[PDB]
Every structure is written in C-alpha cells, then in structure tokens.
Amino acid sequence: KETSASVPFLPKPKNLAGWVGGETEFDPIGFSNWFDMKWLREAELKHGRVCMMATVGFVLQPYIGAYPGVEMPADSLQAVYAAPSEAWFAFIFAAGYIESSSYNGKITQLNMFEDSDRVPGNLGWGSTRLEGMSKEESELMQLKELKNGRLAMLAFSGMVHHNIVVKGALFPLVPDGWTGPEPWAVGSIMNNXXXXXXXX
Amino acid sequence: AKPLEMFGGVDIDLEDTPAHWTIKASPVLEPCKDNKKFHKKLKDELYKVKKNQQKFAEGSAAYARFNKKIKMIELRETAYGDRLCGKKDGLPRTIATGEWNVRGSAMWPAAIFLYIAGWIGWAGRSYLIRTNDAAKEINIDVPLAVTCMASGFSWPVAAWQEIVNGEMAVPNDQIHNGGPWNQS
Amino acid sequence: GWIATDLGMRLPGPAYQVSTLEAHDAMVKFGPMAQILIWLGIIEVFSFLAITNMMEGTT
Amino acid sequence: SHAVKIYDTCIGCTLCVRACPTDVLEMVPASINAAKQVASSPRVEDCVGCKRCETACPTDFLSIRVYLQDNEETQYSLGLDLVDWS
Amino acid sequence: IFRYINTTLWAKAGHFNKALSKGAKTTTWIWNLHDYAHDFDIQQRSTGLIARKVFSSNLAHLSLVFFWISGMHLHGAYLSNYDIWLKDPKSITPSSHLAYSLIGQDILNSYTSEYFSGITITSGFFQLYRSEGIITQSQLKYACATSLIATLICLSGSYLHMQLMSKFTSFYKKFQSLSQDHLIIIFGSRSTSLSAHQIHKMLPANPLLDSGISKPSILQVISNSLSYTLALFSTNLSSTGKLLNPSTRSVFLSQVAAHHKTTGVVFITLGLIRFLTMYKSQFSILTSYIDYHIVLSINLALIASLSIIVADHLTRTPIYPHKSTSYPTILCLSIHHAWLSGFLIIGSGAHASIFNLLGSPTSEIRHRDPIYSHLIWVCIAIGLHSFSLYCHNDTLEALGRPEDIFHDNSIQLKAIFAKQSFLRAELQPDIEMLDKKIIRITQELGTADFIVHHIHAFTIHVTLLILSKGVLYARNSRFVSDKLELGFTYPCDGPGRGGTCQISPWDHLFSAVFWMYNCLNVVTFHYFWKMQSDVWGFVSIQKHISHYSQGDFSVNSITINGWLRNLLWSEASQVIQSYALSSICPYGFIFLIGHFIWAFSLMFLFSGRAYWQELIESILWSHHKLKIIPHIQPRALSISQGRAVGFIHYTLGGIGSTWAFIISRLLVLT
C-alpha cells in the first residue's frame, strides 16, 4: 500500500496517473475518485488561465488602465461598477462565445467527455508552439502552465482579500495609518458573547 | 366633464398616445420621493424606532443596534425614492407589465427564478433518467446527483433541443392514459 | 509559548501588550485566534484523514 | 343483500375464500386457469360487505367484485346482533 | 460484545421491521418506516432486544431532557437579564431569549431592562433560579456544565446498555426491586437530599435577599458561612400557607425545606411498610399487568394526573419567590401543565388499548356493555344539562328575560360543596398583595363557576367514554367479532355491515384527542377569564380592587355570547392589534399561523385518500409524459396517516391560537 508523495501519511491517490502533478499526487479529499478527473483537469486549467489573466488585469487596472473615455477607480474591485456597461456586455458576450464554440456545444459535466474525449484542457489554441520538444519538454511546458495557474489562483485570491482588508488600492500595501487588519465587521455568536452584546 | 365624479372617484387617462403605455405615466401612481404618504409612513417608522431607542441606556449595545436599525430605515427610505407608489397609500408598487427598465419591475426576478427553477427541474429529471431504479432514489448516488446538479446550468438549450428532437415528450400510447370509461 | 510570553517575549505590536492570562481573550477579540483556529482546522482535517485511512488499513 | 360476482380472470388463489368472515365464497372446479379452479359466491345472502375478499385478490383488477346495495340490506348483510329480523 | 455495533445498518433504512425489507417500492414505505421506528415490539429479533431498546431509548431521552436543561441554564447565564431581575424582579420582565437582527426580526426584542432587549420568557426559570439560590453567573455556568455532563453520561449509558444487557438480562422484570429502590432512594432519600440543599443554601441565601441585602456582602455572606442565621429564622409561627412571605409573596422556603424533609421521611417509611402491608387484592393486577404497554399506560396516567395537580397547585399555592405577581408566568405554568395532563392521559388510554390487544385483559372487560353504557348515559345527561344551562341563559337573555336565566341575580345554582369547601387554604378573611399586584384572593365561587365546573365534568366524561370504549372494545365487538386479528391500528374492516370506519382503538384515540383538546380548551378559558376577572389585577390604597377584566366573569360567563364577546373578542384586542408592537409582533403572527394550520388540518380531516390517490395519478400522467418517472411510486397518505396528520395539525393550530391569545394579552397587561 503506497502513499502519496505530497502527503506521505495518506494513501496514494489512484486515478491520478501522469498528467502534471504525477510526482506529487495531491488529492486528500479524493475528488478524482469521486468525479471524472478529466473534468477536474479541465476546470483546474480554466481556473488557472482565467486567474493568470485576472492577476494581470487586476494589477494593471490602477496604473495602465483608463481606456480612452472610461472612468478610473483606484480599488480594482470597484472597476466592475466603474466601467461602461457596453464594454462589459461585449466582453461577457465574447467569453460566452469562446466557451460555447470551443466545446462544440457539449458544455456540460455529463456531456463534456462523452463522445469527443479529446484531451483534458486542450483547445487547439496555440498548439503550433508546442510538440516541438519531442513529448518530453512538452510535458514540462504543461507542468509550467499548471504551476503558474495554481500560483495565479492563490495570488488573485490574495489580491482580492488584500483590497478588501485595506479598502483602497492594491500596491500601496500596508498603507499609512493602517495599523493592522481588523475590518471584518460582521457579528457572530462568539462575537456576540465575547463583546457582551447579548446578556446583562 | 370631470371623469372623477362621473365614475365614482376613479379617473381615466382620456388620451391615446403610446407614451402613456408605460406604468410611470399612470395617474394612480407617483414617484415615492415626492409622495406625502411615503414621507409620513417612513417618518413614523423612524419616530417609532427612535422612541424605542431612547427607552434604553445610552452606552448599551441595544442603543448601537437601534442606531444600525435607524440607518437601515433611512437607507430604505432613500433607496425606494425612485420606486413608484400610489398617490394615496405611499407604499411602493411592483411593476408587472414587462417594462424591464423600471424600479421594482418583476421581469428581472421572473427571469432569474425561471432560470434557476428550470435548472432544478432539469437536474432532477436528468438524475431520474440516469437512475432508472427505486434503490437509487432512497440511497442517492451522490456523485451522479451532484454531476447532474452541475450539468443543469445548460437547461434552456438542452431542454429545447430535446423538445424539438423528440426526446422530452412521450406519445400518449406509451403511458397509462387513465381509468377506462367504456367497454361493454 | 507560556514561558516565552511570561518572560516578556512579544510580537512587535501594541495590541499584544497583555498578560499571558488575558492573551487568549484579548487575541480572540483581536482576530488572530480565529485565524489560528482556521489553520489548525485544515491541519486537523488532514490529521483526521490520516486517522481514518490508518484505522481502516488503507495506509 | 349485496352482490358478489366472480369474473373469468380468477386464478384459483383461494385467498378470497379464506379471507371471507361469513363463508360466502367457495372453490369450484373449472378449466380456465392452471389451477383448474375458480371462486364462487353461492351464499352472498351472508355477505356483510367487508370486502376482505377484494383486499386478498391478487389479479390486476379484482376477479371478485362486491357491489354494495344499501337500499337492500338484510339482517345478515348488516350483522345485526341485538335485534332479530326473523 | 461491542464489535456488533456497526454502521452497516445506517444506510439500510427500514432494517428494524421485516415488513419494510422489500424496499421502498412506494411512498407509503417512507411513512411506514417513520411509523414503526419506535415500535420495538413489532421489530425484528427476540424479546431481549425489546428490553434493551426500551431501556436505552429511555436513557437517550433522559440525556435529551438534560441537554434541554443545560440549554436553559446557558441561556440564563449568558443570554439573559437575570442580573437586573435579581436586583428588581417587580420592574423587570424575565428574558433569557433574544432574536437576531435579521429581516427586521429586531422588532421582536422589547424593552425588559435599561440595558437589555429581548423576548419575555414565561417559563418561570428566573423564579426557579432565585428559589435555588442562584445569584452569580458562575453558579449558572456550573449548573449548565453539570447538565451537559449529565447529558454526556446518559448518552453514553444509552449507548452502553444496548450491549451490556443481553438475552439473560432480567433486572427490568424485577418489579419488587424497581418499586422498592425507586420509592426509598429517590422519593425518600432524594427528597431529604433536596431538603438538605435548601436548608444549607436557600435559607442561608433567600432570607439574605429578602433582608434587603441583595448585596449580601457579595460572597462574604452569600457564599454560605452564615451559620448564625438559624434554620427556622423567619417561620413566624403560624401555619404553612396561612401566612405568606410579605417580601417575595410566597411560602417561606424554610417551610418548603421542612416539607421536603418530612415527605422524604414519609416515603422512606412507606418503603419500609411495603415489607408488610395490604395486598392479595391488587394481586390479579400484579400478575396481569407485567408488560411494557400496561405499565407505560399506568405511568402515563399517573404522570398526567400529577401534571394537572401541579397546574392547579402552582398558581394559588405560591411557592416560588416573586412568581405570583408575574402573571404571565403563573398563566403559563398552569396552562402548559394542563395541556400535558390532557395529552399524557390520552396516551395512557392508547397504551391501555395496546396492552389489551397484545396482552390479555382483566375481568372488567366482560361487563363492558353496562360500563360503557352508563358512561354514555352520564355523558348525555351532563351534556344536556351543563351546556344547556348556557343555551337557556343565552336564549332568555336574547329574549329580554334576564330574571329567568341562571345567574347570581336570578335563578342561582349555588356551588354548595365548594362554598362549604373552605377546608382548603382556610386563610384569614382578607387578601394578600405585594406591589400594586394581587398575590392571591380567594375565588368567590358562584353560579357561573358551578356551570363551568359541570362543563369540565361533562367534557372529561366524554373523553373518558371515548378512551374506555376504545380500550374495552379492542379485542372484539358485537359489530366485528375478530378485531383482535385486525391489530391495534387499522383504518376499518370495510364498508360492510353498514360501514365499519374507525372501529380500531387507534381511531378511538384519534377521536379522544379531539375531545381532550376541547375539554381543556374550556379549562384554559375558565382559568384565563376567572383569574383576570376575580383574582389578578391592580389595587387601590383604600383597599378597593381593580381587576384586569373588571369582574366580567360573574356577569358575562353565564351565556355563550358572554364568552364570545368578553373573552374571545374583547380580550383578543391585545393579540389582534399586535403588529409593529415590539414585544407582541410574533404573538399576532403566530395567532394568524395557528388559524391557518387549524384550518389546514380540515383538508386531511374531511377528505378520504381515494380522491387524493386519483389526483396523484392524474399528475403522475404528466410526469410520465416528460419521462420523469419516480420509481418510489407516489401514493396518497394511508387512511390512518391522513387521520393522524389531520389531528396533529388541528391540535397544533388550536393550541397555537390559544397560546398567542393568552400570552400576548398577559404580556401587554403586565
């Protein structure tokens, strides 16, 4: 009974053959044993790519944003509201078109891989710059894509929550007079009993 | 000749123009931010809540919670200002004419609910079709159940594609029509 | 931790200028105790998985 | 008195006969089923109308049907105990 | 031993009954699974498993009650204004119950103290705590901790006894042992233990509070160390109950401690007497009643009778400090125990029927016709007499002939035995009052009290008629001669013999629940109107009394229209006009919901299941049309289940309606 390389105190996750993290098989909960892991790979790749683009845009907006005629909020979270509804509508339209056409209308966890079991996360976009590495460094390129995607996902999460704890821009990290985060102003039962809101 | 008295109080538009087809042109209604009954009702709400607030200590937590309630009430007053309310009640109205572009319109909630309700029904139907057994209805196949639940998002297209391709309905000669009404 | 806190070792923040007895309540009201609980929760989820997979003999 | 009729769909269960609390039903030989027997109701004057026979009948729709006739009730069909009608 | 405690049956629902082993073919399977869940008798395996299940389930429920007590204690320690209530109980309403500020629910919390807003509780837990010498938050913390520990202990014991007990287990059948140890060690040796608790913690504390030292020098005096106060410090001679404590408006706690000591002594002496006492006559009862259902019915009847005695004794035999003036608390303590008395009496009747069907009955079932016939006659006699005095008064008052009605100012029906029942209390010829509030004044019983007591007797007798008719006619009847083979609960025997619907003892309980509900709704209304009209209320310094209802009972309760107008209409003004009023918004809403639920029950009560089955089939056609096939086939509720659902909704809705109606009014008036 082998153990996973990543978490050595847990059994090695089966159904996680070599895709990217075959050297550090990491599935403690076991979604790969519960779900079609090809769909899981597709979701992870789409999340990683969307988050790479999201980190780049989130960083860029406060400084080199400002499309001619669009208004500029310093807090990049507020940029959704302080943007033209027309540009946002066209952008969502383009995203939906790309999502629908790429999978030939089989955009569904049941129907995603039912007849066109092409490859997990492959869309034929820019494949001309791949496969010249003799299927050995192409796997390394896929590994780099996955690592950058996961790092970008965690980074975008951190950027969003930093902008929330600061309630301002992003890059003025630890702004003047910030003196630490205590901004979560939502009451809680433990908060109610601790702060003596109830009782007495 | 004063249609108000002719019809026992109710008033008629008496004008045939397309510009009056909107709900905002109705003489029964009026924007809430300039309606006397709206002002009086929300002022009475503020007065009652404030009178309750003074009954407690100044530095207590109840005082702070009542301040938060007062802020919520004032935010509600300023938020419903653009909503239409009747010229006699002051209570804002919900628009059910398919306007799509008025405060308090019922088109957006209708669209959202219809989408999510079709999603729920489609997920349930997909699970029932893919589990053609009674054992799978008492002991839910949770992976398949959540797979169908996630797959239900494309219901407005998949359902129509099944309707036109003869995969949703079934001919009446394949299900029990009902009790016999004749034979002799 | 108790030794270090009693002997005077502190984090460079004025919010931590409390005795070790009140450290728990002060930091619960400050916030870091909730975050520590979240992190110990994820680590204990992994520990619970370890126990479940060891007692069942999977590992 | 009620009306207890036996139809051809009977398969000779004998369950209807066993369920009857007043010995209304009986088994008669026949040749329309693999059991070579069908039910009969020679004594429906003793049929109270409990319809236990209908509960016990396993055919798709009951091979034995009890038709209630309330404007027809006799002392036996009513289960009269304190009072005699004879 | 415990290696057989496996989770493999958790996924296998319905394992306990062999009738559910075929699988969930229809939706009736679900309801049957829920119905047979606690029916240990009919479940699979030997009789030893029945004993194990019964005992362990008793322990689990005991743990549940302990958890509820722990929750109440924690609410009192950390979610209550018990501090200011301790300091000034006559100006602060008890409240250990808050509501979150969501969806405007903030409107439910009301001003109870200058530093607290919440829902006024009427459970009387604050008076219990004060009578239990609980002053600091630490005491409530440790009470909650002990109750949680008891919950864990009882849960673990219930878990253990499913395998400690075995096929050879027999300790539950040793009824001599059970009776002796229960009686002595609990009723005697624990009553004296509580007497010790009171003598050593209440009398050291409650007199200190009554002495005006709510300070009690903090812990310098309150934390015991007061052996210079004497046990009978302020008995003031007199007789227990004749003279109340003027400060707390209750019986002196020294007298309560003496009562508990003497009752424990009496119970211990009775346990000693039981070694040689009167027997050999209840001996047929002794041998024939060794069964689960019979002892369950006996205990249910006994506990329900004790509950009604508690209901009548908690109101005008004031034991708790500062409780007689807290009128909503008094009302709740009476009425809740009244309802529990009714419900547990009905359960006793049901389990008597079950015992008759499972075990073998006794001699009284052979002359059942004279019994259940003279019961019928007495029910008819007191129904055509008690109620009609109301109908007669109503008709002759409508006709304008008030001199011909049954009233005090007219033809009067004197309550002869009650008026000569000055034995109870036998207090001095005046009243007692604490602070603008009446503690207790003797209820002057007149004509209206006579008529309403006869109404109570009539309703009790009809409910008893239904129960005893179900019990005695369980095995067989002149109508159906093999009801024993039909089981305990069945819809009918068929449309034959004119119609046999609702002959089962279960259906007799089904009707008896309606009649018990109707019986003590009148009890609730009689109490609620009589106390307001003739006991509760304000005072005048010139010894004049201004009650809440201004003496409406003796002049209006003689006619049904009086009940409709002065009780259900005039006294419902508080609940009906309770919208946007901070404390009583939920009571108005719950009044509306109780009406809705009560009317909703009628759909199940009046309709049969065949119509609903046909409608379900019509809908299932549309479901099958779109390839939506529920393989757990939809079936309408069974006849017995339809009746059960109807009865439950009926009683719940009506109880909620009364509940809101009484509580909102008493909260507004106080």
Ligand code: CLA
């Ligand atoms: C100590 C009390 C006690 C005990 C141990 C039992 C034990 C038993 N009873 Mg019983 N019973 C009791 C009191 C008790 N009963 C009372 C007081 C009544 C009168 C109402 C009844 C009436 C009664 C009947 C009529 C029947 C039983 C039956 C049974 C047996 C199986 C029960 C079962 O599986 O139900 C499973 C448990 C449930 C279905 C609980 C469902 C919840 C109830 C029905 C609704 C409650 C609504 C709730 C209070 C309000 C909701 C709040 C709202 C705001 C949402 C079992 C031996 C049955 C049997 O066959 O006996 C052999 C049977 O037919 N009992």
Ligand SMILES: CC(=O)O[C@H]1CC(C)(C)C(=C=C/C(C)=C/C=C/C(C)=C/C=C/C=C(C)/C=C/C=C(C)/C=C/[C@@]23O[C@]2(C)C[C@@H](O)CC3(C)C)[C@](C)(O)C1
């Ligand atoms: C014609 C055709 O075919 O097209 C081709 C084109 C081409 C080029 C050949 C192709 C490609 C590759 C592409 C497009 C590759 C893009 C890759 C990107 C944008 C990666 C971003 C990673 C961001 C990260 C990790 C962010 C990290 C952020 C971090 C760590 C933030 C860290 C912070 O601490 C810091 C630094 C500050 C604090 O405030 C907190 C935060 C912000 C969190 C394709 C796909 O083949 C297709």
Ligand SMILES: CC1=C(C/C=C(\C)CCC[C@H](C)CCC[C@H](C)CCCC(C)C)C(=O)c2ccccc2C1=O
């Ligand atoms: C309505 C009705 C039905 C049909 C009612 C059924 C089948 C009830 C089951 C419906 C679902 C399963 C109940 C689940 C709860 C409700 C869907 C929601 C209740 C809580 C809401 C307030 C959210 C019967 O089967 C029946 C049988 C015998 C006598 C009378 C009647 C009867 O009156």
Ligand code: SF4
């Ligand atoms: S139960 Fe029905 S099928 Fe069977 S013998 Fe009787 S009538 Fe025939």
Ligand code: SF4
């Ligand atoms: S209705 Fe009853 S009595 Fe009549 S034949 Fe059927 S089972 Fe026999």
Ligand code: SF4
């Ligand atoms: S109506 Fe219902 S309860 Fe009455 S005999 Fe027919 S099936 Fe039985």
